[PDB]
Scaffold this active site. Structure first.
Site, PDB file in Angstrom:
ATOM      1  CG  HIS A  41      -0.533   0.092   2.484  1.00  0.00           C
ATOM      2  ND1 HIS A  41       0.246   1.087   2.924  1.00  0.00           N
ATOM      3  CD2 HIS A  41      -0.518  -0.724   3.620  1.00  0.00           C
ATOM      4  CE1 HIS A  41       0.667   0.895   4.438  1.00  0.00           C
ATOM      5  NE2 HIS A  41       0.115  -0.375   4.594  1.00  0.00           N
ATOM      6  N   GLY A 143       3.484   5.684  10.265  1.00  0.00           N
ATOM      7  CA  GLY A 143       4.815   5.375   9.598  1.00  0.00           C
ATOM      8  C   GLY A 143       5.310   4.178  10.128  1.00  0.00           C
ATOM      9  CB  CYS A 145       3.185   0.521   7.283  1.00  0.00           C
ATOM     10  SG  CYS A 145       1.526   0.837   8.119  1.00  0.00           S
TER      11      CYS A 145
HETATM   12  C1  LIG Z   1       1.168   2.617   8.338  1.00  0.00           C
HETATM   13  O1  LIG Z   1       2.153   3.238   8.500  1.00  0.00           O
HETATM   14  C2  LIG Z   1       0.017   3.064   9.027  1.00  0.00           C
HETATM   15  C3  LIG Z   1       0.235   2.041  10.346  1.00  0.00           C
HETATM   16  C4  LIG Z   1      -1.196   2.387  11.290  1.00  0.00           C
HETATM   17  C5  LIG Z   1      -1.385   3.644  11.308  1.00  0.00           C
HETATM   18  C6  LIG Z   1      -1.493   3.993  13.111  1.00  0.00           C
HETATM   19  N1  LIG Z   1      -1.448   2.595  13.583  1.00  0.00           N
HETATM   20  C7  LIG Z   1      -1.182   1.593  12.547  1.00  0.00           C
HETATM   21  O2  LIG Z   1      -0.995   0.537  12.559  1.00  0.00           O
HETATM   22  N2  LIG Z   1      -1.048   2.245   8.344  1.00  0.00           N
HETATM   23  C8  LIG Z   1      -2.063   2.960   7.820  1.00  0.00           C
HETATM   24  O3  LIG Z   1      -2.322   4.028   8.138  1.00  0.00           O
HETATM   25  C9  LIG Z   1      -3.330   2.104   7.415  1.00  0.00           C
HETATM   26  C10 LIG Z   1      -3.203   2.346   5.663  1.00  0.00           C
HETATM   27  C11 LIG Z   1      -4.055   1.632   4.732  1.00  0.00           C
HETATM   28  C12 LIG Z   1      -3.800   2.055   3.208  1.00  0.00           C
HETATM   29  C13 LIG Z   1      -4.765   1.413   2.364  1.00  0.00           C
HETATM   30  C14 LIG Z   1      -4.687  -0.151   2.681  1.00  0.00           C
HETATM   31  C15 LIG Z   1      -5.173  -0.368   3.990  1.00  0.00           C
HETATM   32  C16 LIG Z   1      -4.094   0.141   5.078  1.00  0.00           C
HETATM   33  N3  LIG Z   1      -4.582   2.491   7.762  1.00  0.00           N
HETATM   34  C17 LIG Z   1      -5.018   2.745   8.922  1.00  0.00           C
HETATM   35  O4  LIG Z   1      -4.521   1.873   9.562  1.00  0.00           O
HETATM   36  O5  LIG Z   1      -6.172   3.057   9.103  1.00  0.00           O
HETATM   37  C18 LIG Z   1      -6.805   3.002  10.304  1.00  0.00           C
HETATM   38  C19 LIG Z   1      -6.183   3.932  11.304  1.00  0.00           C
HETATM   39  C20 LIG Z   1      -6.374   4.117  12.693  1.00  0.00           C
HETATM   40  C21 LIG Z   1      -5.886   4.889  13.402  1.00  0.00           C
HETATM   41  C22 LIG Z   1      -4.741   5.820  13.140  1.00  0.00           C
HETATM   42  C23 LIG Z   1      -4.710   5.789  11.796  1.00  0.00           C
HETATM   43 CL1  LIG Z   1      -3.739   6.972  10.941  1.00  0.00          CL
HETATM   44  C24 LIG Z   1      -5.306   5.002  11.029  1.00  0.00           C
END
Ligand SMILES: *[C@H](O)[C@H](C[C@@H]1C=CNC1=O)NC(=O)[C@H](CC1CCCCC1)NC(=O)OCc1cccc(Cl)c1
Ligand SMILES: *[C@H](O)[C@H](C[C@@H]1C=CNC1=O)NC(=O)[C@H](CC1CCCCC1)NC(=O)OCc1cccc(Cl)c1
Ligand SMILES: [Mg+2]
Ligand SMILES: [Mg+2]
EC number: 3.4.19.12
Lengths: 301, 301
Positions: A41, A143, A145
């Site tokens: 992603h 950040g 991921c």
């Molecule tokens: C990647 O770095 C990030 C890690 C997340 C962010 C806060 N805790 C985590 O584990 N991943 C994401 O932000 C993902 C990205 C999506 C892109 C498209 C495909 C599916 C994944 N999104 C996500 O976690 O959304 C839920 C969420 C919950 C709380 C805070 C945030 Cl920023 C996002």
């Protein structure tokens, strides 16, 4: 003596962490030999990530769209490809710190260490279990991921988890290193949620054995139960059924303490019915289920 | 999101761990530049360790009595000396993996990461606090002496603890890296025991702030207390008094949550009086006091 939540030494994995930036997104990659592994992603755009078509997104990329930084030195990408939900970036430099490693897909109930990273730089290490609902209770900010989970077996690093996203209840979901998600989750921002969890029974029993090894005995009794009658109690309190396989896995702990597995089951049954009554076990006021029998043996030698 | 017991990445310290063998005893040393640091009781004999005279024991040693192994390669000792309760062995090779480091003596209530080692080889990493009674609740088997505790501050490793012994209650005692014991303990096998402990108040409050940041709110109330009236409650429940210094340290957490320190104190006072009533906070059924305010900020950014 003493019993702590213990992670593996993380140095071997620290030497593999890189930064991968694609467009406006930045996250972490795993640099092993001449390939960098990261979540696919990273190629997603803020708009086209409600339902991305990753094959199309990737066809539209070129090697120069990916920026890989190992510490200070930039790594030049010479090829890219996608395997399930992980992106693979061929770089023109093999990682000279590549350890002996394997990719392993683990079973619910198993534990691993997480090296949380931001911008390619390790931030902290902690221990986690794959819950029966295929989530992990992690600690992850934006950040993070591409941070990986791993076990170590005499300097062979077994990578088993790469981090992708956080679910609405604050728990976390990701893939094995071949990009297959644990559980039913998919990498689009949708309405998926964690299902109901259950308690990892064989792990609670292992942790009760750790308690006995360390002098906590108040919960023992003379009773013994059968497997069948115990599993009826487990169902009532939302515990995973106990298989003969698990009984045998608990064998060494049973011998070191002299307490038979079904003897310890009768103690657990009583703790489930009566609670702890203001007492603690290894410093906790609830039953702990994120220690495998292996973790207990490794620390209670 | 999520809150876990988190240790520092340990790679920088792993590269410094060596094996030191003197006679029949084997334990761990810290190899920084051309000096190896380890506990002086490595020179003790099984008989003469009820009350050893270490100055005499050391005068009777020669450089060839110390065997130092860094991985496979043996390190030749070219000098030895004693500073307080640590032995210093000059070796003819500077450690090429020496990080930027400092030696720091910490205050009770502060936390650090422990890299538990056996035979020079890192085994696991975990987080610990210096208890007010100058013990730590560690996980240490025989052969673990010389394992070190440390914090990291932008690739500068601050070593603050070296492990020496286990006390009768199963807790642990050791020195700073200059060989001064934390607490009143001495390195002879005698009848010393841990004194009564107290709960680290400023840390519990920090962990309540971590709970709020992560969505745990059931324990909040509209009440507010004074410092004086709170400290009277603390004394009754065996909590360290709360100083204005601590209130100011808790400042950033107070601002991020909008909850004033003395507002959070009124919540803590009520939890102490009524208990949790079957509820949990960040996965625990008791109040946690081994997270400093710094640890919470670092993980709840
Ligand atoms: C990647 O770095 C990030 C890690 C997340 C962010 C806060 N805790 C985590 O584990 N991943 C994401 O932000 C993902 C990205 C999506 C892109 C498209 C495909 C599916 C994944 N999104 C996500 O976690 O959304 C839920 C969420 C919950 C709380 C805070 C945030 Cl920023 C996002
Ligand atoms: C060093 O490696 C070892 C670590 C101990 C052993 C089990 N847990 C630990 O933390 N240290 C000792 O064995 C010390 C040695 C003494 C030598 C003379 C000066 C004082 C230290 N002894 C000790 O810890 O005795 C208590 C004890 C308790 C349980 C088990 C053992 Cl083996 C020892
Ligand atoms: Mg029984
Ligand atoms: Mg209040």
């Amino acid at each position: 003596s003493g019993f702590r939540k213990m992670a593996f030494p993380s140095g071997k994995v620290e030497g593999c962490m890189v930064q991968v930036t694609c467009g406006t997104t930045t996250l972490n990659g795993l640099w092993l030999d001449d390939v960098v592994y990261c979540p696919r992603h990273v190629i997603c755009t803020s708009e086209d990530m409600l339902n991305p078509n990753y094959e199309d997104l990737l066809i539209r990329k070129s090697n120069h769209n990916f920026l890989v930084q190992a510490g200070n030195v930039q790594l030049r990408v010479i090829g890219h490809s996608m395997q399930n939900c992980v992106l693979k970036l061929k770089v023109d430099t093999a990682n000279p710190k590549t350890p002996k490693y394997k990719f392993v897909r683990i079973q619910p109930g198993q534990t691993f260490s997480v090296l949380a990273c931001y911008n390619g730089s390790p931030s902290g290490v902690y221990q986690c279990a794959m819950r029966p609902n295929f989530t992990i209770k992690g600690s992850f900010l934006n950040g993070s991921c591409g941070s990986v989970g791993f076990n170590i077996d005499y300097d062979c690093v077994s990578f088993c988890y790469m981090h992708h996203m956080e679910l609405p209840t604050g728990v976390h979901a990701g893939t094995d290193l071949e990009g297959n998600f644990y559980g039913p989750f998919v990498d689009r921002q949708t309405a998926q949620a964690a299902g109901t969890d259950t308690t990892i029974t064989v792990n609670v029993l292992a942790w009760l054995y750790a308690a006995v090894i360390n002098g906590d005995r108040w919960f023992l009794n003379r009773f013994t139960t059968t497997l069948n009658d115990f599993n009826l109690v487990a169902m009532k309190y939302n515990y995973e059924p106990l298989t003969q396989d698990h009984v045998d896995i608990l064998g060494p702990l049973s011998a070191q303490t002299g307490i038979a597995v079904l003897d310890m089951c009768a103690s657990l049954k009583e703790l489930l019915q009566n609670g702890m009554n203001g007492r603690t076990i290894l410093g906790s006021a609830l039953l702990e289920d994120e220690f495998t029998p292996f973790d207990v043996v490794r620390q209670c030698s």
